[PDB]
Amino acid sequence: LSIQMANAKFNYGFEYLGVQDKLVQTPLTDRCYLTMTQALEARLGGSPFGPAGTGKTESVKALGHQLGRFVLVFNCDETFDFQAMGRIFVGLCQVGAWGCFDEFNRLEERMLSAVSQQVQCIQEALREHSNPNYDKTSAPITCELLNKQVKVSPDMAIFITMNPGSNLPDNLKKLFRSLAMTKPDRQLIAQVMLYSQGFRTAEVLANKIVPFFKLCDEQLSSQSHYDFGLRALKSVLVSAGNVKRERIQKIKREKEERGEAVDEGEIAENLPEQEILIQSVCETMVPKLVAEDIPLLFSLLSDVFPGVQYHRGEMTALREELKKVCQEMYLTYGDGEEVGGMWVEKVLQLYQITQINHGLMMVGPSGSGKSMAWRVLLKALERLEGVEGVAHIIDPKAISKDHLYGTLDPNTREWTDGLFTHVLRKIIDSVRGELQKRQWIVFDGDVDPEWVENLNSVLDDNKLLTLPNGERLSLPPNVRIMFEVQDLKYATLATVSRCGMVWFSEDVLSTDMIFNNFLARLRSIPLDEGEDEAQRRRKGKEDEGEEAASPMLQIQRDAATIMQPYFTSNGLVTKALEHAFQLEHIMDLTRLRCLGSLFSMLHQACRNVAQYNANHPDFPMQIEQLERYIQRYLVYAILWSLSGDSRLKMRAELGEYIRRITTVPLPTAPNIPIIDYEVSISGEWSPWQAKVPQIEVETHKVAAPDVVVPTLDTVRHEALLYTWLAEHKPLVLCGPPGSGKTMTLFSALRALPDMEVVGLNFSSATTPELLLKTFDHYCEYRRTPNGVVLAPVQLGKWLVLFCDEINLPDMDKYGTQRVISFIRQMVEHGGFYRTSDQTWVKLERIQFVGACNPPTDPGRKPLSHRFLRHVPVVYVDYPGPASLTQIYGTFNRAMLRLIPSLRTYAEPLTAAMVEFYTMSQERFTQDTQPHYIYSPREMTRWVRGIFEALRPLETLPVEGLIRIWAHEALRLFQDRLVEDEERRWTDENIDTVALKHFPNIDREKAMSRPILYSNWLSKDYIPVDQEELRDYVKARLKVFYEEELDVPLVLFNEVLDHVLRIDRIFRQPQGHTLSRFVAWMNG
C-alpha cells in the first residue's frame, strides 16, 4: 500500500494499532495533513502550534496512524524521563517511528536546549537524505546520538507541538515547518460524531450544541473542575448516543412484552433527539455545577434549545429507600422543591456517578451534607439491592504518604503494606467474602498532588495500583474510591479529569434541615444513655413501648416542644444567625459551628433540668418553670454561640438586636450587657456577679497562684467550658496575648474531678507524632470484640489534651495543617488508624481543648473550616477595669500582709495600678509601634515588682509604697516608649494618678523626679542617689575593663539607667555590651 497526497508519497508500515480514536477529517485536519506531509516530503519537521486542546498532538497521531507508522507521544509536564529520551530517540531512528512532543514550550530551559540539540542533529541527518546527488545504493546515513553513530531510517520523523504564549528554538527554526492550529472547527466534528451515533438530525444539533458550550464557558463563573472543551463535548455526544440507544431498547422491550412486531428504524424515527442530547448534557454537567451557575446553565440551555426541558428520571424505589433511611437517621427528606429537595437530588446524582465512574469526588464547602449524603446512599442501597455496604474512611493528609501506600525497606528487602494498600489487599483476598460485599474507600480530607500520584493509575481506566515492591493490584469492580474535599484549590487537573464529581454547594443544606435534625435527635436519643444503648437504636425500627426510655427523654421532649416556635424557618434562631453573620469575628464564622455550639448548650440546658429533677425528687420541674427556663436559656445560648467569638461591643450589639426581635423577657437593668446575666435553674435571670466569690490569697503565692482569682470573665467561661465538655466537643479559646486563656482553662479543667489534664504546647514543627507519643505515654491500646480501643490507663478518668497554641502548626505547601486534620478525624470519626499495624482504633475517653491567639497575629494561621465546624470558639477579651480591680485587689491585699501598717492603702493602691494601666492602654497602641502592647501580664509584673521590693523590708511608710509604685510604673511602661514626649506624658500621668488616689501625701518627699532603686550600695533594695550609683558602676566598669573585655566603655546619663533596668529585671522572678556587663556584675 502506497498513500499519496500532492507531492508526498509514503508507504504504509503495517503496524497493529488496535482500536485507536478516529479524528473527524475537518478542514483544519486536512490542512494539517497537507502541510505535515509536505514537510515530510521535504524531510523537514512538523510544528503544529496553537492554544491548548486544539487537536494538535492527536492530529499528528492521526496522520501517523493513517500511514501505519508507530507514533510515540512524549508529555512535557513534570513527567519527562530524560534518561530514556536519548535511548528513545535512538529507537525512533532505528526502528522507524514517529515522535510527538505535546507542548514542547513547557520544558525548562536546560531541558529545552538539550532536547533541541538532539532533535537538531536528527533533523539534519534526515535532511541529508533530500539531496539528489546522494545515491542511496551506498548511503549509510548516521547521526551523533549518545556518542554513537546511529543509523537513521527514512520513514522516521519528529513533530514538536507548541503552545504560543512562544516560538521554536533558534536551533530548529530553520528546520521545522510551522502550522497554526488556532481554532478547530467544532461544528463539523459534532455533526460527524452525532451522525456516527445514528441521530437523524445532526446538523441542527451540532450547530446548537457547539455554541452552547462556548456560551457556558464565557457566561459561567470560572471554576477549575469545569471543562467545556472538545473532549467534554465528544464525551457528551457519546453519552447522548448511549441514551438514544437505551431509549430504542426500552421501547422495543416494552412492545416485546406486549404483543407487537419490532423494527428498529420505525422506533428510532419517532423520537426527540433534542431531548436525548439535553438529557445527556444535563446528566454530565449539572452534578458538577455550583448552585450559582445551575440557573444560568438552564437559562443558556433554554436559549440555545428553545422549548425543550429536562425532566429528571424518576427512581421511585431508591427514593423510597432514601426516605426510610433518612427517617431512620433523623434526616429530612423531600421530593424536590421542598425542604431538602436539593440534597435528595444530590444523593441521586451521587448514585448515578458511582454507577458510571469507578472514581468520584464530593467538592462542597464545609457543612453541605456530602458525608451524610454518601452514608445515606450506602445504607439505602443496602436495603435496595441486598448487598452489604462497607466504608473505609481515610484522612490521607493525616497519615504520611509512605505509611499510606507502604514503603519498600531500602535494605534487607521486605514489604510493609500501607493503609490504603492493606485495604485493597484485604478486599482482593476476600477472606470474609469481601468480593460479595460492596466497599467504598472514602478519602475524607484535603486532596494534594503528592499523595494521589499512585492513585492516578487506579482512578484511570487501567484500574491498577502499581507499588515499588513490583506488585500490581487490580481494583475489583466492587471497590469505589470516593473523595470528600472542601475545595480543589491544590488538585492537579489530571486527578480531576479521571474522577466524576458532585459539587455540594452550601445552599444544599438549609438551616431548616439542620434544625429538624437537631429536634428529631432530641426527641429520640436519650441524652444520658450514651453509647451502650446506641446499638439498641437499630434493634427497633420504631422502638414501640420505649417512649419513656428514661426521664431524660421525656424532659428533653418537653424542652423540644418548648423550643419549636423559635427554630422555625423565620424564628428567633434564624434571624439571630443572619445578623450574626454580618458581625466580624476573629475566626471565620461557619453556619454549622454556630449551630453545633447552640445545640450543645441546649443539651446542657435539658441536662440541668434533669439535675434539678434529681435534686427535687418529691416535686420535679413543672412545665411553666421549664417553659421560662428554656425560653431564657435559648436567648442565653444564642448569644454565647453566635457572639461568643466577638468583642464585648458586638456581643452587646447582638443582644440589642435580640431584644428588638425576641418575645422572651430580658433583664431590666439599663447599663449591663445581656451576656453578663445567667439563667438560673428557676426561669428568672440572675447576674453572674453574684456567683463570683471574693477570696484572699496567701503572701507566699501572690503573683503566681495557678488558681485563677475568680473574676466575672472566669465565672462565665468555666461554665461554658463545662457545657461544652459534657458533650465532649473540642473547645477552643482565642484572644489577645496575656488575656488569661491558659490559666482559666487549666483551673477549669483541674477543678473537675474526673479530668486528667495533659499539657501540650503546639508549635510550627508539631505533627501527628506528638499526639501519638502523648497517647503512648498516658493511654494504651486494648483489643476488644468490637475492635481496638485506645483508653487512658487510669480507669474512670476522662483524659483531656490541652493544645496550648492550636493555630501555630505550620501549613504544608498546600494549605493544610497535618495535626489539625489528625485531630479533626479523631473528633469527627471518634478514632484514627494505627499506621504500624494499619488498623482502626477508637478513642474511648480522650478529649481535646485548645487555646489560641487570633489568626491575624504573625506566627498564627487560620484553622480549617472542616475543623472549625466541630469546635466552639470563645473570645477572651482583656478583663477590663472592674475585673482587673478585683483580680489585683486580691493580690495587693495579699502583698501588703507583709507590712501591717499599710493594709488600709491596699485598695487605694490597686485602683491606681488599674487606672494608669488603662490610661496607657488607651494612649499607646500597636499602630504607633509594634511593641506598645499592654495586658494583665504587666499588672502581675507590677505586683511582683512591688512584692520583691517589699519582701525584705520590715516596714515602710505610705510614701515609700507610693515611690516603689511609681518606680515600677516607670520601669514597666516608660522604658518601652520610643518618643520623648510620650515619656514626658508618662512622667506627668504617674504623678497625676498618684496624687489623685493619695491626697494629703506630699509629692516632694513621696516622688522626687530622679527615682532610682538599687541593691549594690546597701544590703536592702532601697532608694539611692545618682552620684553614689555612678561611682559604684564606674568602679565596677573599670574592673570589667581588665577582666573580660579590654575596651573602654564610657558611662553617660542614658546608659546608667539601662544598667539599673537590666539589674532590676535580673532580680525579678521570671524576669525576661551592657547585657554582658550587668550579667558579670550581678554574677
Ligand SMILES: Nc1ncnc2c1ncn2[C@@H]1O[C@H](COP(=O)(O)OP(=O)(O)NP(=O)(O)O)[C@@H](O)[C@H]1O
Ligand atoms: N482572672 C485572673 N486572675 C488572675 N490573673 C489573671 C486573670 N486573668 C488574667 N490574669 C493574668 O494574665 C496573665 C496571662 O495569663 P496566662 O493564661 O498564663 O497567659 P495566656 O492567657 O496563655 N496568654 P497566651 O498563652 O500567650 O495566649 C497572667 O500573669 C495572669 O496572672
Ligand SMILES: Nc1ncnc2c1ncn2[C@@H]1O[C@H](COP(=O)(O)OP(=O)(O)OP(=O)(O)O)[C@@H](O)[C@H]1O
Ligand atoms: N439530609 C439532611 N437532613 C437534615 N440534616 C442534615 C442532612 N444532612 C446533613 N444534615 C446535618 O448537617 C450536618 C453536616 O452533614 P455532613 O457531616 O455530611 O457535612 P459535611 O459537609 O461533610 O461537613 P464537613 O465539612 O464537616 O465534612 C450533619 O451532621 C447533620 O447535622
Ligand SMILES: Nc1ncnc2c1ncn2[C@@H]1O[C@H](COP(=O)(O)OP(=O)(O)O)[C@@H](O)[C@H]1O
Ligand atoms: N479534528 C478532530 N477530530 C476529532 N476530534 C478532535 C479533533 N481535534 C481535536 N479533537 C479532540 O480534542 C481533544 C484535543 O486534545 P489533544 O489533541 O490531545 O491535545 P491538544 O489539542 O491540546 O494538542 C482530543 O480529545 C481530541 O479527541
Ligand SMILES: [Mg+2]
Ligand atoms: Mg464530610
